[PDB]
Amino acid sequence: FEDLTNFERDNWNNWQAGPAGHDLYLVDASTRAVEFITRPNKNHAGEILKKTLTGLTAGYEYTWTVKIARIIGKYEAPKVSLRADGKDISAPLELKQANEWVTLSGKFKATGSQAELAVVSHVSASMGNDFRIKELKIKG
Amino acid sequence: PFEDLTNFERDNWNNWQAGPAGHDLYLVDASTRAVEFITRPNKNHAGEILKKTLTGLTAGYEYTWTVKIARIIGKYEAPKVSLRADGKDISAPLELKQANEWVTLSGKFKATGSQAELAVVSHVSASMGNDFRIKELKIK
Ligand SMILES: C[Se][C@@H]1O[C@@H](C)[C@@H](O)[C@@H](O)[C@@H]1O
Ligand SMILES: C[Se][C@@H]1O[C@@H](C)[C@@H](O)[C@@H](O)[C@@H]1O
Ligand SMILES: [Ca+2]
Numbered sequence: 001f002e003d004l005t006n007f008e009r010d011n012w013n014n015w016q017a018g019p020a021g022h023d024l025y026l027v028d029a030s031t032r033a034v035e036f037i038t039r040p041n042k043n044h045a046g047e048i049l050k051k052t053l054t055g056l057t058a059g060y061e062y063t064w065t066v067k068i069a070r071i072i073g074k075y076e077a078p079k080v081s082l083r084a085d086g087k088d089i090s091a092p093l094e095l096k097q098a099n100e101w102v103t104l105s106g107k108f109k110a111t112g113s114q115a116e117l118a119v120v121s122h123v124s125a126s127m128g129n130d131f132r133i134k135e136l137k138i139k140g
Numbered sequence: 141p142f143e144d145l146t147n148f149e150r151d152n153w154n155n156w157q158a159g160p161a162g163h164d165l166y167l168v169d170a171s172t173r174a175v176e177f178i179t180r181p182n183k184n185h186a187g188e189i190l191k192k193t194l195t196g197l198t199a200g201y202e203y204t205w206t207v208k209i210a211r212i213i214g215k216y217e218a219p220k221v222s223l224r225a226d227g228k229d230i231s232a233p234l235e236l237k238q239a240n241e242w243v244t245l246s247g248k249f250k251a252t253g254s255q256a257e258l259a260v261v262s263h264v265s266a267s268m269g270n271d272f273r274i275k276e277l278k279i280k
């Protein structure tokens with residue numbers, strides 16, 4: 001079960017002002033994100049973000065979540081997966097609606113104190129293939 | 141418990157790097173939609189400020205309610221907020237003193253039927269200050 005209200009598309013998801021909530025309205029706050037604009041005539045398929053995550057313990061399963069959204073929404077849709085220690089730990093997720101923030105998730109099992117993580121693009125195209133990543137989180 | 145969190149606040153990439161297929165990466169301010177509480181003059185802003193009749197629950201289960209909130213502007217009175225469910229206080233009042241610092245209110249409640257009555261609570265009636273935004277509410 002999960003009931004998530006982020007107010008995208010001005011959907012209040014049945015939340016209402018209470019008696020003490022006066023003159024409520026929605027605004028655009030801001031959150032920092034890496035932008036992937038994929039310029040012309042470069043190959044944008046492969047590992048697009050990399051990190052050697054330290055502080056792990058062998059045999060534990062860690063959960064990697066990435067908050068990601070397509071932008072612009074024109075031409076080719078991005079397709080993004082997660083990789084850990086060379087192993088694909090998620091299916092390729094196609095990003096479709098512009099500025100709809102979704103979670104890309106995978107789990108991996110550490111073999112030691114660190115793991116080599118990579119976010120992977122499966123679309124080499126520059127026409128479209130535009131998206132943003134605002135958060136990468138690993139929990140265990 | 142392990143957590144490695146990168147949200148790029150203050151442009152901290154937290155040891156994430158562009159991969160070979162990550163061309164011309166940069167940070168941007170992406171939008172994130174939020175309810176603004178500007179608390180106008182000569183109204184009482186203490187009490188239940190946002191509420192929802194949450195459906196689809198199964199009686200007896202323990203649900204955890206999260207709310208991402210931040211003071212803004214930071215002048216005059218500081219907000220103070222908590223969570224309430226079925227008329228019961230499930231979180232301690234927390235003073236949001238740091239402007240633009242996003243914090244997560246969290247509380248647990250067990251359902252009493254098909255639905256639950258949830259309310260975010262303000263403990264500051266003042267209009268002088270007492271300004272904040274809520275960008276996300278989540279129950280799971
Ligand atoms: C018409 Se410019 C072409 O399409 C845009 C939607 C972007 O993907 C841009 O990077 C690309 O060069
Ligand atoms: C100087 Se106008 C006074 O203080 C501002 C910081 C806001 O809290 C506004 O709602 C209030 O009326
Ligand atoms: Ca592009």
Ligand SMILES: [Ca+2]
Binds near residue numbers: 267
């Ligand atoms: Ca105010």
